[PDB]
Design a protein around this ligand. Structure first.
Ligand SMILES: CC(C)[C@H](Nc1ncnc2[nH]c(-c3cnc(N4CC(O)C4)nc3)cc12)c1ccc2c(c1)S(=O)(=O)CCC2
Length: 169
């Protein structure tokens, strides 16, 4: 079955959310697109990006280095489409702003706008965790910006509950 997402809560007509590890979701669902929470040089050193790269047994990092050699780094708010490897048909590498490193939070809208080139995506909550954005604000920008069908995997039950309660106010 194609894009067999299970156990998500529908927030709006095109945004769904689950308390889940994006890596485990990608292995089970094998979505058409999985979103990576990338940086501009596609160095998948830890967090979500490191976990997705490790699940490809480093094939994602080798492919990423070859893309950067030929094309140069991405811009903050930008993206590129590369292979999904064993996780998906394609991986959409999206660079959200890292507010802990001084990048502008307004670029989070540009980051989510990349999702609209793909009909169905499995994605993390951009710029959350160690990128420093307020995760409730990231969900609001997602809901207001994405018009295609997005399935958000948030690997923390405490944050999942706060996000759903924030949305349903
Ligand atoms: C908010 C937080 C709960 C969320 N975390 C996540 N959300 C969804 N799926 C996830 N899988 C993992 C994971 C991590 N490590 C291992 N590992 C196997 C072993 O080698 C370590 N496996 C899976 C974490 C994760 C989140 C969302 C966005 C961002 C971050 C974190 S970040 O990575 O801090 C910076 C980039 C933006």
């Amino acid at each position: 079955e194609v894009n067999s997402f299970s156990g998500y809560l529908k927030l709006t007509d095109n945004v769904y959310i689950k308390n889940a590890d994006i890596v485990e979701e990608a292995k089970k669902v094998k979505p058409t697109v999985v979103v990576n929470a990338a940086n501009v040089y596609l160095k998948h050193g830890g967090g979500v990006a490191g976990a997705l790269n490790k699940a490809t047994n480093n094939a994602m990092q080798v492919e990423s280095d070859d893309y950067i050699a030929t094309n140069g780094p991405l811009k903050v708010g930008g993206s590129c489409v590369l292979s999904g490897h064993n996780l998906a048909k394609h991986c959409l590498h999206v660079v959200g702003p890292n507010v802990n490193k001084g990048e502008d939070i307004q670029l989070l809208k540009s980051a989510y706008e990349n999702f609209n080139q793909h009909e169905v995506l499995l994605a993390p909550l951009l710029s959350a965790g160690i990128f420093g954005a307020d995760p409730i604000h990231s969900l609001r920008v997602c809901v207001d910006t994405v018009r295609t069908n997005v399935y958000l995997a948030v690997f923390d039950k405490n944050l999942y509950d706060k996000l759903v309660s924030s949305f349903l106010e």
